[PDB]
């Protein structure tokens, strides 16, 4: 039997984990509130933030429009 088990299921809100590598928090890198967005899987890793970011291309929150956190220090690359 080369084919293993998989099909479509959620992890039930059983434990409050990051939402896109679904790991748990860190102390570098603890489930923080991107946005005012609050019950849901909402809570992603503060650098996990950034890659998300970076693919989806936003910046702010899809809903709410919430500029999200993102420890900034220098202006670094920029679209133009
Ligand atoms: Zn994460
Ligand atoms: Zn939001």
Redesign the pocket.
């Given at each position: 039997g080369s084919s293993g088990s998989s099909g479509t299921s959620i992890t039930p809100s059983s434990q409050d984990i990051?939402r896109?590598?679904h790991?748990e928090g860190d102390d570098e890198?603890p489930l923080i509130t991107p946005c005012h967005c609050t019950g849901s899987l909402h809570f992603?890793?503060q650098a996990?933030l950034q890659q998300w970011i970076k693919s989806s291309d936003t910046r702010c929150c899809e809903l709410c429009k919430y500029e999200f956190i993102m420890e900034t220090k220098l202006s670094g690359p920029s679209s133009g």
């Open positions: 990051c896109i590598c790991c890198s992603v890793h996990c």
